[PDB]
Design a binder for this molecule. Structure first.
Ligand SMILES: *[C@@H]1O[C@H](CO)[C@@H](O[C@@H]2O[C@H](CO)[C@@H](O[C@@H]3O[C@H](CO[C@H]4O[C@H](CO[C@H]5O[C@H](CO)[C@@H](O)[C@H](O)[C@@H]5O)[C@@H](O)[C@H](O[C@H]5O[C@H](CO)[C@@H](O)[C@H](O)[C@@H]5O[C@H]5O[C@H](CO)[C@@H](O)[C@H](O)[C@@H]5O)[C@@H]4O)[C@@H](O)[C@H](O[C@H]4O[C@H](CO)[C@@H](O)[C@H](O)[C@@H]4O[C@H]4O[C@H](CO)[C@@H](O)[C@H](O)[C@@H]4O[C@H]4O[C@H](CO)[C@@H](O)[C@H](O)[C@@H]4O)[C@@H]3O)[C@H](O)[C@H]2NC(C)=O)[C@H](O)[C@H]1NC(C)=O
Ligand SMILES: *[C@@H]1O[C@H](CO)[C@@H](O[C@@H]2O[C@H](CO)[C@@H](O[C@@H]3O[C@H](CO[C@H]4O[C@H](CO[C@H]5O[C@H](CO)[C@@H](O)[C@H](O)[C@@H]5O)[C@@H](O)[C@H](O[C@H]5O[C@H](CO)[C@@H](O)[C@H](O)[C@@H]5O)[C@@H]4O)[C@@H](O)[C@H](O[C@H]4O[C@H](CO)[C@@H](O)[C@H](O)[C@@H]4O)[C@@H]3O)[C@H](O)[C@H]2NC(C)=O)[C@H](O)[C@H]1NC(C)=O
Ligand SMILES: *[C@@H]1O[C@H](CO)[C@@H](O[C@@H]2O[C@H](CO)[C@@H](O[C@@H]3O[C@H](CO[C@H]4O[C@H](CO)[C@@H](O)[C@H](O)[C@@H]4O)[C@@H](O)[C@H](O[C@H]4O[C@H](CO)[C@@H](O)[C@H](O)[C@@H]4O[C@H]4O[C@H](CO)[C@@H](O)[C@H](O)[C@@H]4O)[C@@H]3O)[C@H](O)[C@H]2NC(C)=O)[C@H](O)[C@H]1NC(C)=O
Ligand SMILES: *[C@@H]1O[C@H](CO)[C@@H](O[C@@H]2O[C@H](CO)[C@@H](O[C@@H]3O[C@H](CO[C@H]4O[C@H](CO)[C@@H](O)[C@H](O)[C@@H]4O)[C@@H](O)[C@H](O[C@H]4O[C@H](CO)[C@@H](O)[C@H](O)[C@@H]4O)[C@@H]3O)[C@H](O)[C@H]2NC(C)=O)[C@H](O)[C@H]1NC(C)=O
Ligand SMILES: *[C@@H]1O[C@H](CO)[C@@H](O[C@@H]2O[C@H](CO)[C@@H](O[C@@H]3O[C@H](CO)[C@@H](O)[C@H](O[C@H]4O[C@H](CO)[C@@H](O)[C@H](O)[C@@H]4O)[C@@H]3O)[C@H](O)[C@H]2NC(C)=O)[C@H](O)[C@H]1NC(C)=O
Ligand SMILES: COc1cnc(-n2cnc(C)n2)c2[nH]cc(C(=O)C(=O)N3CCN(C(=O)c4ccccc4)CC3)c12
Ligand SMILES: *[C@@H]1O[C@H](CO)[C@@H](O[C@@H]2O[C@H](CO)[C@@H](O)[C@H](O)[C@H]2NC(C)=O)[C@H](O)[C@H]1NC(C)=O
Ligand SMILES: *[C@@H]1O[C@H](CO)[C@@H](O[C@@H]2O[C@H](CO)[C@@H](O)[C@H](O)[C@H]2NC(C)=O)[C@H](O)[C@H]1NC(C)=O
Ligand SMILES: *[C@@H]1O[C@H](CO)[C@@H](O[C@@H]2O[C@H](CO)[C@@H](O)[C@H](O)[C@H]2NC(C)=O)[C@H](O)[C@H]1NC(C)=O
Ligand SMILES: *[C@@H]1O[C@H](CO)[C@@H](O[C@@H]2O[C@H](CO)[C@@H](O)[C@H](O)[C@H]2NC(C)=O)[C@H](O)[C@H]1NC(C)=O
Ligand SMILES: *[C@@H]1O[C@H](CO)[C@@H](O)[C@H](O)[C@H]1NC(C)=O
Ligand SMILES: *[C@@H]1O[C@H](CO)[C@@H](O)[C@H](O)[C@H]1NC(C)=O
Ligand SMILES: *[C@@H]1O[C@H](CO)[C@@H](O)[C@H](O)[C@H]1NC(C)=O
Ligand SMILES: *[C@@H]1O[C@H](CO)[C@@H](O)[C@H](O)[C@H]1NC(C)=O
Lengths: 208, 213, 228, 444, 126, 242
């Protein structure tokens, strides 16, 4: 479940089923690649360290779902939000409710900082060779790598990771091309063509 | 008392008798009511006549009253031996209280005689260890009520320690009395006998005890 | 402050027994409640059970007959056991303190209330992967610098299992410009990640830049010096 | 003259004790509309300016235990219920096997019963669920309604109300009602200050057990009344001078499912509960009840020796309606556990007290014959505020007497409910024909 | 003065004889359970009224409240006196003594009336 | 048609006060007045005043206008026509001419011209005003005598001597032998002490068939005496029968 909100506005998040009695909903926030943290306990009670911008629906309403309201949306709040339902009519829920990812808009485009690395001199002696193409600081995370042997693309041997953000608009993607020590000295140059939203950045490398 | 009755009045058995009850105009009898009562000395009175010529509940029709403009009268037809007592009259209205009279001693004549019964008692044994000595001379069943008691110390008039009560009416329409003689323990063992004389209409009765026996 | 750290094997064969440990630092393991949470990749967190002194310990109704918790007061740390593991138990197990609460709605006397819990101080978390494969030692290969006033420089870790691998630069003396990338699961069944650092072009010293690589499942610590 | 003559007199103040047919009176504001089960419309309005003549110099012997106004009201109320329930819906087809289950929550009590039911047509059935209290259902080896094996059941119309409104009992022409207006009177014996009235004061037909509610307050000291104190087989009616405060609530926002069970008939079932599953309760201030119980025991020592011990305990056993403080509160019938109010032991010399109450929807005629009623459920958290003006106490006939006496509550006979308000009234008939003698003779 | 209905119940018979029009003015007063309850009672009210009025009418006391008759007061009926009845006794206290001889006196009051009427018709014929 | 009972006889010194009660039973206490009349040696019977228990109206005589207070309690109903009540009287400034017997009387009628007239009286409470203290009596047994030799009768009794203020009653066998009792009044001596006598006439054939016990009670002194009269006489006229 995704709900995009413009920065500076107010955010809404729904989690859990509909209330059947008096509840005490516990809200959490999971930063991408980090550990979940406590946001609001007991429906609408914030501990020390959480600003008053976060407010949850009171557990005194019978029939409504747990709603998490976030005033003044910022790019830092872009993370996952899970809830823990404590219902007097329902048994104890040992599985958190399916979360909802907050999408901070107003982020048009980011330029990927690609970097190509040839195989090391210590690896060639091991009768192995592999090209490394690092891609970072790009938004949104949607890129497709296309290796080039001279002016001809390379089919098999291509290993590429999936984009993943790191607590910012920066995503991560790593492309690998498994070749042989005899394949490297064969062609004159190899390229790492990585397309972004509408651009195509390419870096080449030549043996010595 | 401001209300005057008859000091004494008499009447034979089976006849009637009238009692007067007069006084100043402030108490009798214009604009005043009259009531009669049978009040034996020492007992509880009995209402006879109320509201002038009206008898009280439970009163035999042998009584009758009449109030003039200056005095009221009470007529008791067919006299009874128990009627020989004192009668008082009251004057009252609807607002004021009562004002009794002087009283009337009614003596019903034509009754039978009654010789007195005298019994003298010597001092008891518990009294001789005190020590004192008292003679008890009781008189009863004598009519009318008028007797005199005289004591003697071994056929010698006594002029010290003599006392006698007044004749009192009994429940059987007769009178009773009593007399005592105060003597010292020395004269009880010095005299051969003591007597109690009781005079009644000339006939004098007497009883004698003997300390020597 | 309260610093919680988990440390376990990270790789357990199917139908065996998992043994984890939460090294506590900041408070006593007796004056607070403790709870463990696991989370599969791309799923929602699942509660496992809480543990406290005086025999206050409850298990998950779905994992009741397998889990066995304990608290080591003489060592000040939290333990965890899980017998008969399968492929569905592969998740990220956390260690967090628990503060209890009492939500009252009725008249109190008639037990018309319920006790709710919430974790406030989580831990860094440990990675546990369930598989019947053996652990392989990674092979580190240095990446030479190559290029405007700025230059790049990084290392490489190839063919290891399982995740993860901790990479540090200069033993932690370089936290500006480091961008460690996630690994890639090849067809052979071995992950491979990289790590680069943006340093100025005046790199020659020799400053002696070196990357520290550690792999807990294999106890492999390799130091490779990078030189142009 | 002296011989008196008989002279007839008309309109003499002479009366003798007798019994007649009494009627009612119900103010003018009692505009409540719809139609209450009793006094709405059906009763004669009350005189805006009632009249009460104090019979000076008159001393009369009353008797609350041999009064006929109690027997009339006791049976009049019974016939009033039979009259209001005659045209209401009959629930004979509701006696079907009930496949029940526990209520949705986390001592099960409420049961979610599903069953088949006849529709408007006489062919297809209807698989509709309900929610009956456990006291109204009984299993069989699935459940069944408790009355199906004893009595026929009829649902009370929802247009009527169970609220008691004041009803004044009046006597027709030629009769009169005497009111003993002395501040200390145990209901029996000669009355010092007596007065006459055509109608009694506002008496609300409240039917409660153990605890007397919304009644009349005693004057000066709390009054104690008993038919035979030396006989432990007779109840002891109590009356309070200062009323104790009691608050009852059913914290369950119920739902009314209108099921159609044929042509014209419509059964009102219980739907899903909105909110928490909370049981009904009644509160009594601990400060006030501590002073009232201590004020009644001071009057009990005037009948069982000055220096004695008095103990209070709950009911010994028997039926449910007597062992628990049962009554009505907004439509639902309660059955409150009274083990917290009679948990004391008095010798010769800070919030509230809550009671665990239960609710039944099927109630059987106290005549013991097989006619029961289904009380339609009420919607919303019900809340009633009532007074408690008296008690209905019993005494366990211990063989070791004159040691310590134990008092246990009770009830079961609503005649005592009417005796608590009809202790100061009795029926007499006026006979205006009286001869007397006087010196008056007519013509030739 | 004015005392109300039955106001002189405890007063003397002579004093209660003044309020004889007060207890007589309030002696008549002008299908569903509550509907037929009072209807059967108000029917018994006029029957109780016409029962005393019939006896009052046959005794020559039809339009009379305090009538005098020509029946000698037998001494066996508690021979009280004049100032002992009207000045120290209540009607409630008096009816208890004559309660035995109530139906006895009612038989003589009827013979005297039928005889007064028949003797009255003989005079007008002449 | 009831019964009025008064308090016991008390001895009060001149200058003090005395409270005489008057309990009623058998009639409505509020329907009749309560009159108080005394009778002394000087000036004869003297009515003092009455009081209406119903309203509380009092009417005192000019002679007792500023030294007598009358009070009545509330009526205690028993039946519809009878009840029980009590009336008191407080006379202050006692003198020597106030020695006599006091009576409380029930009213006659309720309405009319004789409503307060006294009709039903009590038994009377004797009041003695003197400075001498209460002295206990001295009961002495009397030896039987011969009343009739040919009739076979005798006479025995008890002797009460030296008793001050007089309220004295003499019974026999706890009120069993009341036939033939002849109690004579007392005598006023020169010292201030009275002394009466009692005697009962019984046949001579009764010796070991009846117990003679005279009960002399004197409440002012709070003493009761029970004497055993010896059936053996000493008269020479009665020994002829034994
Ligand atoms: C017969 O007799 C029996 C027994 O006497 C009686 O039974 C009683 O019934 C009543 C009502 O039926 C029942 O009341 C409930 O009490 C609940 C518990 O309240 C108590 O605890 C709290 C907190 O204590 C904790 O925290 C303290 C630190 O803050 C800590 O020190 C403690 O140790 C403990 O851990 C306490 O604050 C309460 O104090 C209240 O009472 C005082 C008088 O005694 C009063 O002076 C106080 O002001 C206070 O009243 C309120 O004050 C502010 C407003 O000024 C509110 O914000 C507070 O919340 C107080 O209510 C008590 O000591 C209580 O939670 C219940 O109220 C919640 O639940 C109902 C039903 O579900 C909801 O409708 C309410 O809206 C409310 O829901 C809010 O609170 C809960 C719990 O925090 C949250 O989970 C909800 O999300 C919601 O909070 C959010 O929404 C609200 C919406 O307005 C918003 O304002 C908030 O900011 C938030 O965003 C309910 O009041 C009582 O327990 C029960 N038993 C007893 C013994 O009394 C029967 O009723 C009697 N019957 C009859 C007929 O008479
Ligand atoms: C209930 O029962 C009770 C009791 O059974 C009954 O009360 C009795 O009522 C009857 C009448 O029905 C009363 O009988 C009458 O009493 C009249 C009152 O007497 C007058 O005189 C009193 C004395 O005054 C003198 O003394 C004072 C000093 O004390 C001095 O200053 C005066 O100048 C004067 O010298 C006086 O105190 C008394 O006052 C009372 O009454 C007035 C009202 O008038 C009241 O306001 C006062 O507060 C006070 O209570 C009164 O003035 C008496 O006059 C009357 O006699 C006349 O009437 C009869 C006819 O009834 C005529 O035949 C006669 O010729 C006179 O003209 C009559 O005797 C009786 O006394 C009451 N008490 C009893 C019986 O104990 C109630 O009525 C009953 N009530 C009911 C509803 O049933
Ligand atoms: C001892 O004596 C006390 C004092 O009288 C008595 O308290 C009374 O309790 C009863 C309930 O037990 C109360 O009756 C109900 O009161 C509620 C709330 O009243 C509010 O509204 C009125 C204005 O109407 C205000 O004056 C008052 O102050 C409150 O604010 C009402 O909501 C109830 O109405 C229903 O019932 C009536 C009669 O049955 C109907 O005429 C009415 O239409 C309602 O019925 C229907 O209403 C809806 C349709 O409009 C429908 O959806 C519903 O489902 C329902 O079918 C009712 O009047 C009473 O008010 C209390 N007394 C006082 C003075 O407030 C104790 O009960 C008594 N003890 C015992 C044991 O009897
Ligand atoms: C007493 O017992 C009765 C049973 O006899 C209960 O009545 C049942 O109540 C449950 C509520 O939990 C009902 O189940 C719900 O039905 C809803 C209606 O379904 C309609 O819509 C679907 C299309 O979506 C149609 O195909 C269908 O024909 C209906 O027209 C569903 O929408 C509900 O789904 C929700 O809950 C599930 C729970 O996992 C979620 O996963 C879903 O995403 C969704 O949010 C739900 O299935 C049931 O139908 C009722 N049955 C009857 C016969 O009434 C009473 O509630 C119970 N009362 C008490 C007090 O215990
Ligand atoms: C729904 O109902 C279930 C019932 O199964 C309920 O789970 C139960 O909770 C209670 C208390 O929350 C548990 O009882 C505990 O038992 C242990 C001994 O084994 C005690 O040591 C515990 O005492 C601690 O907790 C108390 C909670 O009030 C504290 O007051 C106390 O001081 C101690 O800190 C406690 O009594 C019971 O074991 C569980 N049952 C199961 C099967 O786990 C659940 O809480 C209910 N949920 C809701 C939302 O209503
Ligand atoms: C429940 O009572 C009936 C049920 N059902 C019927 N009928 C069904 N069909 C027919 C023709 N009658 C009834 N008839 C007369 C009835 C009664 O008066 C009657 O006994 N009480 C009504 C008054 N009361 C209560 O309020 C009450 C109070 C505290 C606890 C329990 C009940 C007592 C019992 C009657
Ligand atoms: C309500 O009626 C239906 C019939 O339409 C019942 O369903 C039958 O149940 C019996 C056993 O109880 C089975 O043998 C039948 O096969 C069922 N289907 C039929 C008869 O068509 C249902 O059980 C009833 N519900 C109750 C009794 O609660
Ligand atoms: C009991 O529940 C009903 C329905 O579940 C509540 O009725 C609602 O009342 C609110 C305002 O009070 C309205 O806005 C809703 O539209 C109503 N619901 C429906 C379906 O109409 C009722 O308020 C509840 N009562 C209590 C005391 O909580
Ligand atoms: C019963 O309920 C009444 C009213 O609901 C209570 O009276 C209230 O008392 C509080 C004090 O705690 C006051 O603040 C309110 O103003 C009162 N209400 C009214 C309408 O005056 C009463 O205290 C309750 N008693 C018990 C024993 O619960
Ligand atoms: C009424 O209340 C009393 C006491 O509150 C209840 O007695 C309890 O019974 C249970 C068994 O059901 C015991 O476990 C408790 O110990 C008892 N309490 C006490 C204080 O002894 C009683 O069950 C309740 N219900 C009835 C009908 O009496
Ligand atoms: C009865 O009263 C009359 C009044 O006229 C009176 O003459 C007569 O003596 C009274 N009789 C009795 C017995 O009191
Ligand atoms: C926890 O820390 C202690 C000391 O810091 C150490 O001895 C122990 O090995 C640690 N736990 C694990 C599981 O390594
Ligand atoms: C009261 O009961 C006792 C014993 O139960 C009995 O002896 C007596 O006759 C009854 N009636 C009373 C005391 O008036
Ligand atoms: C009066 O009553 C007596 C009854 O004692 C009766 O014998 C007598 O005949 C009655 N008088 C007349 C005239 O009938």
């Amino acid at each position: 479940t995704f709900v995009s909100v413009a920065p500076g506005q107010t955010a809404r998040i729904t989690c859990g089923e509909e209330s059947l009695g008096s509840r005490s909903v516990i809200w959490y926030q999971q930063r991408p690649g980090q550990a979940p943290s406590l946001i609001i306990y007991n429906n609408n009670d914030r501990p020390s360290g959480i600003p008053d911008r976060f407010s949850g629906s009171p557990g005194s309403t019978f029939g409504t779902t747990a709603t998490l309201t976030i005033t003044s949306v910022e790019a830092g709040d872009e993370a996952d939000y899970y809830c823990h339902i404590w219902d007097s009519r329902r048994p104890t829920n040992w599985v958190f409710g399916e979360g909802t990812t907050l999408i901070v808009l107003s982020q048009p485009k980011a330029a990927p900082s690609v970097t190509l690395f040839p195989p090391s001199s210590e690896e060639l002696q091991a009768n192995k060779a592999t090209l490394v193409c690092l891609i970072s600081d790009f938004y949104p995370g949607a890129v497709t790598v296309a290796w080039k042997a001279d002016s001809s693309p390379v089919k098999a041997g291509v290993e590429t990771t999936t984009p993943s953000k790191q607590s910012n608009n920066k995503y991560a993607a790593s492309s690998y091309l498994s070749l042989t020590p005899e394949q490297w000295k064969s062609h004159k140059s190899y390229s790492c063509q990585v397309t972004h939203e509408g651009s195509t950045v390419e870096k080449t490398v030549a043996p010595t | 008392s401001v209300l005057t009755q008859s000091a004494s009045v008499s009447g034979s058995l089976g006849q009637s008798v009238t009692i007067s009850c007069t006084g100043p105009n402030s108490v009798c009898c214009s604009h005043k009511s009259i009531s009669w009562y049978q009040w034996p000395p020492g007992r509880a009175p009995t209402l006879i006549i109320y509201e002038d010529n009206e008898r009280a509940p439970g009163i035999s029709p042998r009584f009758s009253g009449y109030k003039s403009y200056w005095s009221a009268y009470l007529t008791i037809s067919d006299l009874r031996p128990e009627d020989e007592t004192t009668y008082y009259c009251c004057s009252y209205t609807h607002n004021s209280g009562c004002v009794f009279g002087t009283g009337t001693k009614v003596s019903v004549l034509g009754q039978s005689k009654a010789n007195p019964s005298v019994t003298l008692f010597p001092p008891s044994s518990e009294e001789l260890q005190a020590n004192k000595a008292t003679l008890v001379c009781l008189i009863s069943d004598f009519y009318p009520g008028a007797v005199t008691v005289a004591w003697k110390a071994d056929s010698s008039p006594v002029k010290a320690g003599v006392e006698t009560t007044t004749p009192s009416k009994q429940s059987n329409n007769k009178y009773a009395a009593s007399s005592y003689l105060s003597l010292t323990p020395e004269q009880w063992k010095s005299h051969r006998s003591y007597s109690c004389q009781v005079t009644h209409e000339g006939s004098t009765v007497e009883k004698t005890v003997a300390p020597t026996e | 402050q309260v610093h919680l750290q988990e440390s376990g094997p990270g790789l357990v064969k199917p139908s065996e027994t998992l043994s984890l440990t939460c090294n506590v630092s900041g408070t006593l393991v007796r004056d607070n409640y403790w709870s463990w949470i696991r989370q599969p990749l791309g799923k929602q967190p699942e509660w496992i059970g809480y543990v406290h002194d005086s025999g206050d310990t409850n298990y998950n109704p779905s994992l009741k007959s397998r889990v066995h918790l304990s608290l080591d007061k003489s060592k000040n740390l939290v333990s965890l056991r899980l017998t008969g593991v399968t492929a569905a138990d592969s998740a990220i197990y956390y260690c967090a303190t628990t503060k209890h609460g009492r939500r009252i709605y009725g008249v109190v006397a008639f037990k018309e209330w319920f006790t709710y819990f919430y974790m406030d101080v989580w831990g860094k978390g440990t990675s546990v992967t369930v598989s019947s494969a053996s652990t392989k030692g990674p092979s580190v290969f240095p990446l030479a610098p190559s290029s405007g006033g700025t230059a790049a420089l990084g290392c490489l870790v190839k063919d290891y299992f399982p995740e993860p691998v901790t990479v540090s630069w200069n033993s932690g003396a370089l936290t500006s410009g480091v961008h460690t990338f996630p690994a890639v699961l090849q067809s052979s069944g071995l992950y491979s990640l990289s790590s680069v650092v943006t340093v100025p072009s005046s790199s020659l010293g020799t400053q002696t830049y070196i990357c520290n690589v550690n792999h807990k499942p294999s106890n492999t610590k390799v130091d490779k010096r990078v030189e142009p | 003259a002296e011989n008196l003559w008989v002279t007839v007199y008309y309109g003499v103040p002479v009366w003798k004790d007798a019994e007649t047919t009494l009627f009612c009176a119900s103010d003018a504001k009692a505009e409540t509309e719809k139609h209450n089960v009793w006094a709405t419309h059906a009763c004669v309005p009350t005189d805006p300016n009632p009249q009460e003549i104090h019979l000076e110099n008159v001393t009369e012997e009353f008797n609350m235990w041999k009064n006929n106004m109690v027997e009339q009201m006791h049976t009049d109320i019974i016939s009033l219920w039979d009259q209001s329930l005659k045209p209401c819906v009959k629930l004979t087809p509701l006696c079907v096997t009930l496949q029940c289950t526990n209520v949705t929550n986390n001592r099960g009590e409420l049961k979610n019963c599903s069953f088949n039911m006849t529709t408007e047509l006489r062919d297809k059935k209807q698989k509709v669920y309900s929610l009956f209290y456990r006291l109204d259902v009984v299993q069989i080896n699935e459940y069944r309604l408790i009355n199906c094996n004893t009595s026929a059941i009829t649902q009370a119309c929802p247009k009527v109300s169970f609220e008691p409104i004041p009803i004044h009992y009046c006597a027709p022409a030629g009769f009169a009602i005497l009111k003993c207006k002395d501040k200390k009177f145990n209901g029996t014996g000669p009355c010092p200050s007596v007065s006459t009235v055509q109608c009694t004061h506002g008496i609300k037909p409240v039917v409660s057990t153990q605890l007397l509610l919304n009644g009349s307050l005693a004057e000066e000291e709390v009054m104690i009344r008993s038919e035979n104190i030396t006989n432990n087989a007779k109840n002891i009616l109590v009356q309070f001078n200062t009323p104790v405060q009691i608050n009852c609530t059913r914290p369950n926002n119920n739902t009314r499912k209108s099921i159609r069970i044929g042509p014209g008939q419509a059964f009102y079932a219980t739907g899903d509960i909105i909110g928490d599953i909370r049981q009904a309760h009644c509160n009594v201030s601990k400060a006030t009840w501590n002073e009232t119980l201590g004020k009644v025991v001071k009057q009990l020592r005037k009948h069982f020796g000055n220096n004695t011990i008095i103990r209070f305990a709950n009911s010994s056993g028997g039926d449910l309606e007597v062992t628990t403080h049962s009554f009505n509160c907004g439509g639902e019938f309660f059955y409150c556990n009274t083990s917290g109010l009679f948990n004391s032991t008095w010798i010769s010399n800070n919030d509230s007290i809550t009671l665990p109450c239960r609710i039944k929807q099927i109630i059987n005629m106290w005549q013991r014959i097989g006619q029961a009623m289904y009380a339609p459920p009420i919607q919303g958290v019900i809340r009633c505020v009532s007074n408690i003006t008296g008690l209905i106490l019993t005494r366990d006939g211990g063989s070791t007497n004159s040691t310590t006496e134990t008092f246990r509550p009770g009830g079961g006979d609503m005649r005592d409910n009417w005796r608590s308000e009809l202790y100061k009234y009795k029926v007499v008939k006026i006979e205006p024909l009286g001869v007397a003698p006087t010196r008056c003779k007519r013509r030739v | 003065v004015f005392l109300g209905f039955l106001g002189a119940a405890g007063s003397t018979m002579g004093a209660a004889s003044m309020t004889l029009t007060v207890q007589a003015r309030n002696l008549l007063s002008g299908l569903t359970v509550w509907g037929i309850k009072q209807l059967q009672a108000r029917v018994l009210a006029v029957e109780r009224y016409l029962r005393d009025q019939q006896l009052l009418g046959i005794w020559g006391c039809s339009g009379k409240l305090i009538c005098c008759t020509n029946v000698p007061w037998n001494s066996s009926w508690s021979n009280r006196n004049l100032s002992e009845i009207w000045d120290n006794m209540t009607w409630l206290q008096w009816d208890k003594e004559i309660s035995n001889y109530t139906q006895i006196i009612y038989g003589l009051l009827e013979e005297s009336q039928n005889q007064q009427e028949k003797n009255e018709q003989d005079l007008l014929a002449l | 048609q009831g019964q009025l009972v008064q308090s016991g006889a008390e001895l009060k010194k001149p200058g003090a006060s005395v409270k005489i009660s008057c309990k009623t039973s058998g009639y409505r206490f509020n329907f009749y007045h309560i009159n108080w009349i005394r009778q002394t040696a000087g000036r004869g019977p003297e009515w003092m005043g009455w009081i209406s228990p119903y309203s509380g109206d009092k009417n005192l005589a000019p002679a007792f206008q500023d030294r007598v207070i009358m009070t009545t309690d509330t009526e205690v109903p028993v039946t519809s026509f009878t009840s029980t009540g009590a009336a008191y009287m407080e006379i202050r400034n006692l003198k020597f001419d106030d020695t006599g017997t006091y009576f409380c009387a029930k009213g006659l009628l309720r309405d009319g011209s004789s409503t307060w007239l006294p009709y039903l009286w009590g038994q009377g409470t004797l009041l003695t005003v003197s400075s001498a203290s209460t002295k206990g009596p001295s009961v002495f047994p009397l030896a039987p005598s011969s009343k009739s030799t040919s009739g076979g009768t005798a006479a025995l009794g008890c002797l009460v001597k030296d008793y001050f203020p007089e309220p004295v009653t003499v019974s026999w066998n706890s009120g069993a032998l009341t036939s033939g009792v002849h109690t004579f009044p007392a005598v006023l001596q020169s010292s201030g002490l009275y002394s009466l006598s009692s005697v009962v006439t019984v046949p001579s054939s009764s010796l070991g068939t009846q117990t003679y016990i005279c009960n002399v009670n004197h409440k002012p002194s709070n003493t009761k005496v029970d004497k055993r009269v010896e059936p053996k006489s000493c008269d020479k006229g009665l020994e002829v029968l034994f």
